Amino acid sequence: VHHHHHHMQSRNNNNLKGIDVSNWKGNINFESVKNDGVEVVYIKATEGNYFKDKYAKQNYEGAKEQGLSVGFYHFFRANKGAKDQANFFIDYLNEIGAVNYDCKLALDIETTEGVGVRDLTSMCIEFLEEVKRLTGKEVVVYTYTSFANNNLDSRLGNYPVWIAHYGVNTPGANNIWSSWVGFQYSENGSVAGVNGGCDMNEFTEEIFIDSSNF
């Protein structure tokens, strides 16, 4: 409970250096990524209830063999069942044998698919809770400032956020969150081992999984 106005933290060199990738990046040299000082790598696993990212397994194994902390994210499509997507997401992680990820499972919500604020937010909650039920692990929500302020409601504030807001040292005013565990500050980074623009992030220690229901 707030007793005064809270605000998003600014970047800090002591936070975890991270990146996030998907099939869009193709083959990645994680030894190079590691040598660049990167500490965390989020990997796209699934999208909707039908798409599997072909590079999820090689990215997971490639990053882990270099000692990088890893997490997975799911690109949400609100026109598909929430629990259905949660199961599709986790089923794929098990299919590729990714059973030692270090970071919270991420819900990438950035499109409405025509769904209203209350309903879209409820779908997100159902997804998050189903993922928690299935894995016994914790979750995090990825979205961008304007989306949080106009397309979702405060109930999602009960979950930590990995917020996207490029070109700034501090994420903008947010009606749902006043603190972040993740901050995607650039989509054009030059990272060794990664071809083309790379998503750049800062993560706090709270991005790590540190509990289980089992």
Ligand X SMILES: CC(=O)N[C@@H]1[C@@H](O)[C@H](O)[C@@H](CO)O[C@H]1O
Ligand Y SMILES: CC(=O)N[C@@H]1[C@@H](O)[C@H](O)[C@@H](CO)O[C@@H]1O
The one catalytic residue among 20, 138, 199, 202: 20
Near ligand X in 102-161, by CB under 6 A: 102
Which phi and psi angles does 102 have, rounded to 5°? -95, -25
Instruction: Give the distance from CA 18 to its chain's centroid.
Output: 11
Signed CA dihedral, 164, 169, 171, 172: sign only:
negative
110 is catalytic: yes
- Enter the DSSP assignment of 18: E
Please identify which residue in the block is written with the tokens 């970071």.
103
Task: State the nearest-atom distance from the C-beta of 144 to ligand Y, in Å.
Answer: 8
Task: State the nearest-atom distance from the C-beta of 20 to ligand X, in Å.
Answer: 16
Task: State the nearest-atom distance from the C-beta of 4 to ligand Y, in Å.
Answer: 32
Q: Is 29 exposed, middle or buried (0-12, 13-18, 19+ CB in 10 A)?
A: middle
Q: Which residues are paired to 101 by β-bridges?
A: none
What is the rounded end-to-end Cα distance, in angstroms, of the chain?
29
Q: Is 197 exposed, middle or buried (0-12, 13-18, 19+ CB in 10 A)?
A: middle
In the numeric block, which tokens belong to residue 158? 């009960």
Near ligand X in 178-207, by CB under 6 A: 205
Task: State the nearest-atom distance from the C-beta of 176 to ligand X, in Å.
Answer: 26
Q: Is 108 marked within a binding site?
A: yes
By CB under 6 A, is residue 37 in contact with ligand X?
no
Q: Which of 3, 37, 67, 114 binds ligand X (CB under 6 A)?
A: 67
Closer CB to ligand X, residue 69 or residue 184? Answer: 69
Choosing among ligand Y, ligand X, none, which partner's interface includes residue 151 (Cβ < 5 to 8 Å by kind)?
none
DSSP letters spanning 114-145: T--HHHHHHHHHHHHHHHHHHHS--EEEEEEH
The one catalytic residue among 36, 84, 110, 129: 110
By rule CB under 6 A, what count of residues binds ligand X?
Answer: 5
Question: Given the rule CB under 6 A, which residues bind ligand Y?
Answer: 20, 22, 44, 73, 75, 108, 110, 142, 184, 199
The Cα–Cα gap between 126 and 169 comes to 32
Choosing among ligand X, ligand Y, none, which partner's interface includes residue 85 (Cβ < 5 to 8 Å by kind)?
none
Contact residues: ligand X, CB under 6 A: 67, 69, 102, 205, 208
Residues that constitute the known binding site: 69, 102, 108, 110, 184, 205
Which residues are documented as binding site for N-acetyl-D-glucosamine? Answer: 69, 102, 205
